[PDB]
Amino acid sequence: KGRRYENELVELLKQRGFTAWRVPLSDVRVMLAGQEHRVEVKMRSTPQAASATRILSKLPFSCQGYRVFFLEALDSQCKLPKNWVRWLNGAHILAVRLPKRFTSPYGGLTGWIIVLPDTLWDAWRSEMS
Amino acid sequence: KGRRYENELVELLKQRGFTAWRVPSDVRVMLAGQEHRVEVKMRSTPQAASATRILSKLPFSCQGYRVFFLECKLPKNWVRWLNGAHILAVRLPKRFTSPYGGLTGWIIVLPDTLWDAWRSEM
């Protein structure tokens, strides 16, 4: 009931070596370079419902100061999807979950798309492997 | 190395039924389902913590905060110690706080808005 995907994202981040946890308030927290960051979690049933249809083939890319990528992707990298700016709602990281059947042909094995500020990309990469 | 008292406060809060932790304002506490930074200060004497005249007054409300032992204006050192956070935890040796009712040595400085959510978590 919504917490399901927040817990899934927390376990996926903890598997990749991140210190992550859940805060009901409906938010997720992550440690990047020794700093706590709020992660907004959105789940949509289809790429159209998440305004990601034209996005999927472009990942990873940088747009309006954000790096947008599939959760497991480490490959080298415009307006941004209007629904996404509203979804950030104060937080700086956004995690969008789609069914894996939609993301997987494009390389998104887990179904998650991470919208992260460009300032945080260096720290995010140095918290894996 | 300063982390000893943050861990002590986290265990004391978890004992009283709070969801508290130290991040790898290093302490976080969950009040009514909301995450709050807790600033931790440890001082060797009541004078070093600007608490000499405070100890006999606890518990009280001053400048919009409820000041009490863990279990009128506020000291100027304390406003600077909050430094952006909204909750402040001051630790003194128990020998100083105990004759006044502070068995643990901790003084909590909590906003009046959070007093209702703090009470209903014990």
Author numbering:
A (entry chain B): 5 to 29, 39 to 90, 98, 100 to 150
B (entry chain A): 5 to 28, 39 to 85, 98, 100 to 149
From the paper:
Amino-acid sequence and structure comparison suggested that the enzyme belongs to a group of enzymes classified as archaeal Holliday junction-resolving enzymes, which are typically divalent metal ion-binding dimers that are able to cleave X-shaped dsDNA–Holliday junctions (Hjs). Holliday junction-resolving enzymes are nucleases that cleave four-way DNA–Holliday junctions (Hjs) into two unconnected DNA duplexes. Activity screening demonstrated that purified recombinant Hjc_15-6 acts as a resolvase, cleaving Holliday-junction oligomers.
Moreover, this signature is situated within the most conservative part of Hjc_15-6, where the putative active-site residue Glu10 (motif I) is located in α-helix 1, Asp40 (motif II) in β-sheet 2 and Glu53 and Lys55 (motif III) in β-sheet 3. This may be due to the gap between residues 30 and 37, which are not seen in any chain in the two models. The electron-density map of Hjc_15-6 suggested that each monomer has two bound sulfate or phosphate groups with full occupancy.
